[PDB]
Symmetry: C2
Subunit: 120 residues, 2 copies
């Protein structure tokens, strides 16, 4: 959940040089708390395997760019639903925002898979 | 693999024909090159229906399609040249490597977006 740089390296099992390069290119970043999440471990492990096929850290900038733009769109769509959460006795509940976010990601992913299958 | 007629897609997705119409006219969902739908269209249609139920109209999904098409090209630039590099032994098919590579890049991209989204709502 909340991983240090050392934890990230140890769990991803990549070279420190790879991590350093992916941070330098902005491909991976820490969250608002200043630590890494489980997604970072998966990004790092996928980035290592891709580097092995010829993809440099520098080439994954395009993926990060697009993911940030997609996150903005999702925010616009999901952000309004934070206030509609079934809070119960608590003051806040973002569970519907998370549901809309997860549906939009699954939709977007399936579009990619479809288009990639086509072009190949 | 799997080539669905329009009515096969409606039956498997349990989504209304009018919703499919709206998605096709917005350009969010398209048929493959032969005029069939694939298994991914089932998921897309069902996700679009649940999104519509949260007030997100098919036309507001257009941007996910355009983005998906740009990403698909970036993945093809990587994977495309590796088609010819797959082992072609008796127990192999040459498409495998380019598929594995596409699947890594898609997994990478999915994690990036999940990470960017967690942060945009933290
Ligand atoms: Hg991996
Ligand atoms: Hg879905």
């Amino acid at each position: 959940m909340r991983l240090s740089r050392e934890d990230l390296l140890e769990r991803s099992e990549v070279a420190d040089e790879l991590l350093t390069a992916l941070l330098k290119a902005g491909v991976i970043t820490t969250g608002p708390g200043g630590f890494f999440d489980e997604h970072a471990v998966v990004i790092l492990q996928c980035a290592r395997a891709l580097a092995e096929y010829g993809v440099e850290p520098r080439h994954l900038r395009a993926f990060r760019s697009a993911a940030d733009r997609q996150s903005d769109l999702i925010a616009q769509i999901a952000g309004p639903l934070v206030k509609a959460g079934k809070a119960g006795a608590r003051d806040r509940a973002d569970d519907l925002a998370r549901e809309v976010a997860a549906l939009a990601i699954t939709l977007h992913t399936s579009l990619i898979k479809s288009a990639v299958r086509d072009v190949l």
